[PDB]
Amino acid sequence: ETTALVCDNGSGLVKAGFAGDDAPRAVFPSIVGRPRHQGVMVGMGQKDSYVGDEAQSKRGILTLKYPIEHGIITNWDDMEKIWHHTFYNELRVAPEEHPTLLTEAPLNPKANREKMTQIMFETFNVPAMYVAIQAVLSLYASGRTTGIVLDSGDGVTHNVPIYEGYALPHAIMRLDLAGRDLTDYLMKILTERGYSFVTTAEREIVRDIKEKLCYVALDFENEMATAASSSSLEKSYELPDGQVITIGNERFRCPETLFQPSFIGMESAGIHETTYNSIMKCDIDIRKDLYANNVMSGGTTMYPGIADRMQKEITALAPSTMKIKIIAPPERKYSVWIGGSILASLSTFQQMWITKQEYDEAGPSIVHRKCF
């Protein structure tokens, strides 16, 4: 018939597709490249700027901008290029024909929603749309109405507790630690072993090292004693030019900074202790159920061992008599999209859309009262 688009801006990856699909079919990094060198050959078809996987391929000659930093859109002209690329090139669909559903992290500036709506209605002429909290969608994605969602992608981390479909807006926590800043730390520890990555093209190489080789130690201090006292832990990786690099304690040491942000220099406690401090802000009747369901979402939660490390130290913080249960499906990297896929295909949701009439009547302010 007609089917809602569902789009997640994330940071790093964009992932997009149609409502009721099983998984997104547009997936590509939300990255905008411009050529920085002097162009010599006359007539090779050089563009002004490349987007997504095209910029990943040519990135040798490009500066790469990420237009979203910590879930805030910092650069709007380059964001419009990414949406334009998603609808026209990647999904090949005319945006007037389809309601769109868009995803955002909580506790971020309201100008971000005013602008994102103004652009959706006025340039695309999208007939109706909605903006949904990323954490909320992970429960739809996992078949629950109760839990505390710990969600971290690139950029923002946030915890949102939900008890039978009621949010608890006073107990929401947000942290800026996740995903990119892990990489910007890993470059400095690799520099300590005498490899130096100085440019945005090299950053993507480090990000792939992180994705292949990093893992979370169950006990950080014993494993640093192990790596210091042994070779066994040390693993070797091949750069795109066929050089080979060897990485020992650095590989576990990098995702450890999720649990001890002091390494990068933040004040706040790690994700375990903002999770616990989130649950403590909820009234005593429900903690029994929030401890019974903890849902991990987004790709920065996919380091091996992170689920165990969470369950172990929360079982250290919590009262001694309770199930602490961490629920981390292997699908979790896509959960916020799968949850939006479900939400957009409900029937009850069809009243919820902001429709173009109501924006014409009331202007971008309407988003705040209709949307969460």
Binding site: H70, I72, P109, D176
Partner: peptide, 7 residues
């Protein structure tokens, strides 16, 4: 952001 941070 606009204040307490670079974005």
């Amino acid at each position: 952001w606009x204040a307490x941070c670079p974005a």
